[PDB]
Design a protein around this nucleic acid. Sequence first.
RNA 1: GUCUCCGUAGUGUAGCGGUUAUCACGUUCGCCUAACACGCGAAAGGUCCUCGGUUCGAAACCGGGCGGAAACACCA
RNA 2: AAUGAGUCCACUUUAAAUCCUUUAACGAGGAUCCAUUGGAGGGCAAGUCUGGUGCCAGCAGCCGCGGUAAUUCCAGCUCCAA
RNA 3: GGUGACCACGGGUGACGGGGAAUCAGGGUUCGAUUCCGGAGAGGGAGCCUGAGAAACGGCUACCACAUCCAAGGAAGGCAGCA
Lengths: 441, 131, 58, 185, 70, 262
Amino acid sequence: EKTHINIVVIGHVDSGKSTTTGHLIYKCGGIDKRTIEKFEKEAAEMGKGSFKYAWVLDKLKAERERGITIDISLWKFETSKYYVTIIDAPGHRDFIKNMITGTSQADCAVLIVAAGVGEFEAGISKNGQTREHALLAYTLGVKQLIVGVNKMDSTEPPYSQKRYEEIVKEVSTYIKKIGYNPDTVAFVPISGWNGDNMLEPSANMPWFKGWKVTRKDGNASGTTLLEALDCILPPTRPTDKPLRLPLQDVYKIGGIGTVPVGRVETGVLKPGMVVTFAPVNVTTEVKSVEMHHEALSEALPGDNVGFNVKNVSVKDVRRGNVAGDSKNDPPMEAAGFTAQVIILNHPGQISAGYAPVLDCHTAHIACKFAELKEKIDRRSGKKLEDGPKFLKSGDAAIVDMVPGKPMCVESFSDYPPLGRFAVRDMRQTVAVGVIKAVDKK
Amino acid sequence: NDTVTIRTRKFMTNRLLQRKQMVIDVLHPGKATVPKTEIREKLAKMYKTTPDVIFVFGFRTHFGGGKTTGFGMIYDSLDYAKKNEPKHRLARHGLYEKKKTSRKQRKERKNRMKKVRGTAKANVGAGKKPK
Amino acid sequence: VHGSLARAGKVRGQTPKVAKQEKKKKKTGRAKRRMQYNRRFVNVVPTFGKKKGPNANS
Amino acid sequence: PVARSWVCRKTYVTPRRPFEKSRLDQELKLIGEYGLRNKREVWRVKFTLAKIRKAARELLTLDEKDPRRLFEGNALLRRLVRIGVLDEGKMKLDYILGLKIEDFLERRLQTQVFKLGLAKSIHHARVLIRQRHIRVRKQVVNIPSFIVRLDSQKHIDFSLRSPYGGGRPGRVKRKNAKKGQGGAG
Amino acid sequence: QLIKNGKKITAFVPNDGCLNFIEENDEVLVAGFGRKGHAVGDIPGVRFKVVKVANVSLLALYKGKKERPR
Amino acid sequence: ARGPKKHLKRVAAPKHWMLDKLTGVFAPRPSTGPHKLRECLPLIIFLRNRLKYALTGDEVKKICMQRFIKIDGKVRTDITYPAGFMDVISIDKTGENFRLIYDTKGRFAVHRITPEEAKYKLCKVRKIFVGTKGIPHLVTHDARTIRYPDPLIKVNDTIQIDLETGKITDFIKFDTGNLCMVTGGANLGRIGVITNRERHPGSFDVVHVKDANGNSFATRLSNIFVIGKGNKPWISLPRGKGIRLTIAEERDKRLAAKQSSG
RNA sequence: GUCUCCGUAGUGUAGCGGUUAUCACGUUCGCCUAACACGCGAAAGGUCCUCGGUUCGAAACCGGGCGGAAACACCA
RNA sequence: AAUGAGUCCACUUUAAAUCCUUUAACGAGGAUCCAUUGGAGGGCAAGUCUGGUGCCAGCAGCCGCGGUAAUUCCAGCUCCAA
RNA sequence: GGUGACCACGGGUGACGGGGAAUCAGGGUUCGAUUCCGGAGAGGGAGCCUGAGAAACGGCUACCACAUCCAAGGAAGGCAGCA
Ligand SMILES: [Mg+2]
Ligand SMILES: [Mg+2]
Ligand SMILES: [Mg+2]
Ligand SMILES: [Mg+2]
Ligand SMILES: [Mg+2]
Ligand SMILES: [Mg+2]
C-alpha cells in the first residue's frame, strides 16, 4: 503493498468539511456504528444535531460547544487499493495558521463548496475562504486537487443539475488563473448530511453521468470520491536524500514519555540512530516508531508518523522544529536566507521595514526584509531593472530575510517540500514563492 | 605452518565422560593467535585421532604474542561427543543447530497461551494471527 | 534599589581586545618535567643578582 | 546481586602542606634524575616505603622471639633482598628503617635499562620501554615502573620483534627504503 | 526564590559582567558563598552566589565557551 | 523469611569448600542429608574443584546421572548430596576410592584408598536409646540408625561399620589414651591421643589431646571422634598424618621442597 | 492549539486620527571639596513590543505575530 | 631512526557478539595526532613587566587592592602548582 | 504488687541493627539507605484460604486513598522486581 500518501479536506467556513469526511470514514468502515450512535445522542443532548458526523473528527470540547473546527484531526481508514491518511482542517479566517500546518504536510487536497443558496455566494467573495485556500494549497506542495459540490439537497430545487454545472465552472474559472487544469482536477457531487454517492451510486441522481480526468500518466473515470481517491497519482519519494522532519505536534504519553509527531518527506526514519533538532540544537536518539498506534521498522517519506525520543522534555522541542539525522547533514538555524516571492494583493506598498509572517514546514513566525536586493518579472526570472525602491502588487522580487526568532529552512533547489512557503499579513496571503539560497549558522 | 608448535600439559584421562583432558599452549612466534581448526588437526596428529572429535576452546594470547594458552578436549568416539558436550561447541563445529527464535517472542507466546484455556486448537493457534 | 546596575561589565567592555600571540606548543608530561628540571637544577649562571626569581622583570 | 569485587586502594598519598620550596626541589631532583612523568609516582614509591617502614617499625616494638616477629620478619626481609634494595648480609629489621627511596627508584625497569646500557638516557629508556622494545626473561614488558628482582636483572634484553634484536625494521625505515627504490631504477 | 520551600534569598553574581547575562525569571543554580551561611567579604548579609543560569554555566558564558540559548 | 531457605551465597559458603569470588554469586547449597551443611562437601565441588573431572555445573550433572558415583555403598544421583566425614566415595568405573577426611588445616582432602579398605567405615555413636518392645537403638554421627547393638557401646564411641550390610563389625571404646581426630573448631583435623577428659555438669565437656610431636591441645567433647585403639589408627591417615605445624615449618618445608626440585 | 489581559524614554509611565510629552527619578553634565558629604545649573533619553492594513496622514481605528501574565484542553 | 592514538584483514574471545591480547596493510616535524584547570601582595610557588579602568567596574576564603604611575581589577606577555 | 537520679516513664531521631567505611602517634571523632547475616514492608490498615512452612499481596476478602474499561448493567487494579 500500500502506498503512503495524505489527503486534506478543505473548504469554506462552516462548509461541513468535517461532516463530509466523517461520513466517508463511516462508509469505508473506519469506526463502528454504536459509537456514532453514541455521538448523535450526545450531539442531540447539547443541541447541534447536524454535527454528529463531524463529531468523529471534532474531538475537542470547545470545538463541539462552539460548533467550529479549531485544530487538526488525523484519522485513518483503508481504501481498496492502498493505505490512505486523512487530516481535518478548520477552514476559518482566524485559524488560518492551523490549516497551513496540515496543508504543508499534505499530498492531495479536496476542496468542497456548498451548493446551497446563500452558502455559495458567501463562499465566493473577497472575504471568501475558498479563494486563498486554493492558493495556499498550490504554494504548499499540493499538486493533486479534487473539487466536490456538497449539499445539493439544501438548494432548491433538490437535484437541479444546472446548479451543479454552474458552480463547477465558477471554481474552474478561478483555478485557470491559479494554475490548475480543469481536465486534470476531478469534480463530483456529494452530500454532507443527506448521505448519497460515497461508496455506491445514488438512486436519487439520474442526471449525474460520470466524471472523467485526463493526465499525462493516463485516464481515469468514476462516480464517487473513492474512484478519485484510488486514481490519484502517487508522488515521487526522494528516499535517498538526507532526512528532514518538521515538528507537527508533540505529546507526552504516560509510560513512554515525549512523542513528536510529524510527516517524513525525505529519507527513512528508523529506531536506533540519533537525530538533531535545528531551532533548539538538541541531539537525541530515536526510541520507537509508531503511526496510528501501529509499530513500524522504517518511515518512508510521506509518512505522518510519531517517533519516540529519550531524555527530552516536552518544552525542549516544540512544534515547527525540523529533525534530521545527525550522521547526515543536520539542519541548523538560518540567521538569513534569500527567497523569491511574487505579490498577490496589497492596498499599500512594500518598503524596507515591513514585517509579514512567514509560514513554512509547520512554522509560523514574523520576519523582516533586511533589504530589497532585486525585482524581477512575473516569470522566467528575467532581470529587468536594478535598484529596488518599493514593491506593489503583481510583481516578483528577490530579498534577504533575517527573522529575529530562531528558524530553519532549506533551499527549494534541494528540498521541494521545505522550500514551499507562504507569506501573509492582514489575514490575507500577500506573497508566495520559494527559497533559493540560505545562510547557515 | 613453518614455526607453529603445540605443547600439552595437565593431561589426565577421565572415562567419567570417556575423554582425556589437557591444557595446551601454542607457540605462534610472529603469527596471530593460530585458528582453532589448525590446533584441532595438529592435536589430532599428536594423539592419532580423526580431526572431527577434538574440542578446543578458551584460547588466551599472552602479552607480546608467542604463547597462547587453551583448553583441550578429546573423546574416544564422536557418539560420546554428541552425548556430553555443551551445545555451543557442537554448534561451533556444525554438528548441532540452534535455528530458533529469540527469547522475547518465546515469553510472549507462553503468556499468550496462558490467556487461552484448554482448547488445543486455540492453544496452538494463539501465535498464528499475532505474528 | 538605587538603580546603579547600569554599569555592569563596564571595564571589561572598555578593555581593548588584543589577541593572543601564537606560540610553540608547550612540551607536556615527563618532557615538561625534563625542561624545568634542566632549567633550574643543571645550570650555572656566572652573572650576579642575589638569586633572582624565575619571573625576573629586569 | 552482582559478582564484582570492588576491592581497590590508592597507591599514593599527597603531601600535607603544599608549596614548600624544600620539598618541591627534592621531588623535582628525583623526577629529573630518574625520568618520572609526574609527582604521583615519586609519591607512590614514597608511600610504598612508608608502608614498609610502618610494618618494620611494628615488628621492632614487638617482643623478640615472638613467632609473628620471626615469621613476618624474615618474610619482609626475604622479599626486600629479592627485589634488591637490601644487601644479602644486611638481614636485620633495623637496617630496613635506614632504607630510602632512591634504591626503590633505581630498581625500576626504566632505570635498569639505562644502567644496563641498553638505553642512551633515562628518558630514552622510558620511551624505549613504552614502545614495546625491551623484554625481561621471555616476556616483553612496556611498563617503566616494573621493579626487577636480582634473578631477573640479568635477563633484561631487547625483544625479538623490535628493530633492535631480530629483523623486521620499523615502518619509517621501510617507507624510507621504498621511497629510495622508487626514486631510481 | 527557591523552587523548593519557596524561600527568598539574595545571591551574588561573581564576575565582572555576568549580571547582563542574567535576565528576569530564569532558573539559577545558587550555591553557598564559601563559609557556611556566613557573609563573605564586604557584601553585607549575602551568603549565596549564582553558579548557573538557564541551565548553562556562568563560567562558560563569561569565558565565551557557549552562548545564551537565543 | 516465610519458609525454608534454598539458596547459599558464594561469600556465605563454608571456607573449607575453598570457593572463589568471581565465578558466580551462589554456592552449591547442599541438600539435606546425613551431615550438616557447614561440615559437608556437596558432590558438585568434589568432582569439579577437588578432582577437576567436571568443568561446570551441568558437566557434573551428566556424570552423576550416568551412575558411577557411589557414596557409602549406594549410588547417588544428587548433584548437591552432602558427602560428610569419612564417607567412602567410590567411583568404580575409574577404580579409585576416596575416604573423606580433613587435612591438617581443617579442610577435606583427597584421600585415595584401597578397594578392600573401602568396604568398612567408622562412625561415632551420638545417642543410645531403647525403643518399643525393649529394642535398643543406636544413632551415629551420620543420620544412620541401627538396632540391636552390643550393650557395651555407650555415647560418643566409635563403631566399626561395614558397607552393604550396615552391621557393626567392631567398635572402639572412648577411653583415656586412645587415638582420636578432632572434627570441629580451631584444632579441626588434628590427630592425637586422649590425655584427659575434664567434665562440666550442665555444660560441654573439655578433653585434652596430645599429638605425636608432643603438642597438647584441648577441644569440646562434641568435636572428638576416636579413630584408633590406643595408638594404632584404624584408617589410612592422609598425608601429613594429622599433625599440626605452625607457620614456621611449612615455610622451610617449601624451601626444602623447592630447593630439591630446583 | 484555543482564548483573555498587558506591553510607550532605562525605570514611574500621559497622550489628541494631526503633539512621544511631562513627571519622581536613573544617567551625562557644569557645581565645591585631596577625596567626599551637602547643596546649586541644564540636558540627553521614544520605530508608542513588531509588522502592516484603514485614512489625506494612526502609537492609539483594525488585523496579525512576538514576549510577559492569566486560564481551557492536548495521549503514537 | 622508533612508535602507538587512529583507519582496518584475519585470528582469538563469546551462547552470539563487543572489548582486551595476537597479528596483516596504512598511520608523526608546528610529529597543527595542538593538555587542561586554577593562580602570580602575604598565608602560599610564581612578575615590584606592558596596555586599559580610575573607590567605578570589579577582585578578595582572611588580611586587604582599586578615588589617574593598581606588584591584587580587565587583557597581553611571562612564570608557578597539579 | 512491679519500675525508677545506677535516669524509670515520656519525647526526638535527617534511627533499620551488625559485619564494616572515612580520618589515622596513642586515645578518639564521624559514617554505615548500599551487594554478607538478621529484621520489616509491599499504596494505608484489618481479616483469612491452601500448605510442612504465609497473616503471602507477580493469593483472596473488606474498608480508606488513588486510578482503568464500559454498550453505564458491570468488570478489572497494586513496578519499595527487571527495564
Ligand atoms: Mg594578571
Ligand atoms: Mg527512618
Ligand atoms: Mg545497613
Ligand atoms: Mg511481608
Ligand atoms: Mg505440601
Ligand atoms: Mg498482606
